[PDB]
Design a protein around this nucleic acid. Structure first.
Ligand SMILES: [Mg+2]
Ligand SMILES: [Mg+2]
Ligand code: NA
Ligand code: NA
Lengths: 95, 95
DNA sequence: ACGACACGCGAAGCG
DNA sequence: ACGACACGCGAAGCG
């Protein structure tokens, strides 16, 4: 059977966010971070027409702790860094 | 508090698929389709290193019925078209 | 392709 | 930046 197609409504869905090393440190390259990606909630889906787009109406900042290794003459220095994620909490179709 | 960052594992998540008018009809432009987008399941997330990527291991074809209006001298002709969606069912990190 | 339907909403039906 | 840990797995601890 072929079921009726259902519109993907404008709402929050779980997406994959890649953790930016550049925001962790823009002035040094000598480091590794873990994990490289986390889940975030994001507004996606399609509105009625192309005069409007699916956009967040409230966003929530969420700090997470990442693992950082600084490499100094081939030796690891273990540190922690805090990345502030942005979660979409609600969406609307917006002009 | 800043919770520990958790890796976004390579697995299936719900994504938004935009319905291609071109696959519905490549030889005529005189038509509209509804809905413009549907949910599908897709492999996403991050593997251990950049020598591997998150890829589907089994995919399931899923036909859905879309609404089509053919416009002929400004009058609508109501038709149905069948679009075959591809859902990801499982994923692995692959080299 | 230039924002039918007694209306408004969504070869529709309801109130 | 050139694939520590008695090992293998993941300034680790377990078996
Ligand atoms: Mg009537
Ligand atoms: Mg020991
Ligand atoms: Na009507
Ligand atoms: Na050890």
């Amino acid at each position: 059977i072929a079921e009726p197609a259902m519109i993907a409504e404008c709402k929050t869905r779980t997406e994959v966010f890649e953790i930016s090393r550049r925001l962790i440190d823009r002035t040094n390259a000598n480091f590794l971070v873990w994990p490289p990606c986390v889940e975030v909630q994001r507004c996606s889906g399609c509105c009625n027409n192309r005069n409007v787009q699916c956009r967040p109406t409230q966003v929530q900042l969420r700090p997470v702790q990442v693992r950082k290794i600084e490499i100094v003459r081939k030796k690891p220095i273990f540190k922690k860094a805090t990345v502030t994620l942005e979660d979409h909490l609600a969406c609307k179709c917006e002009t």
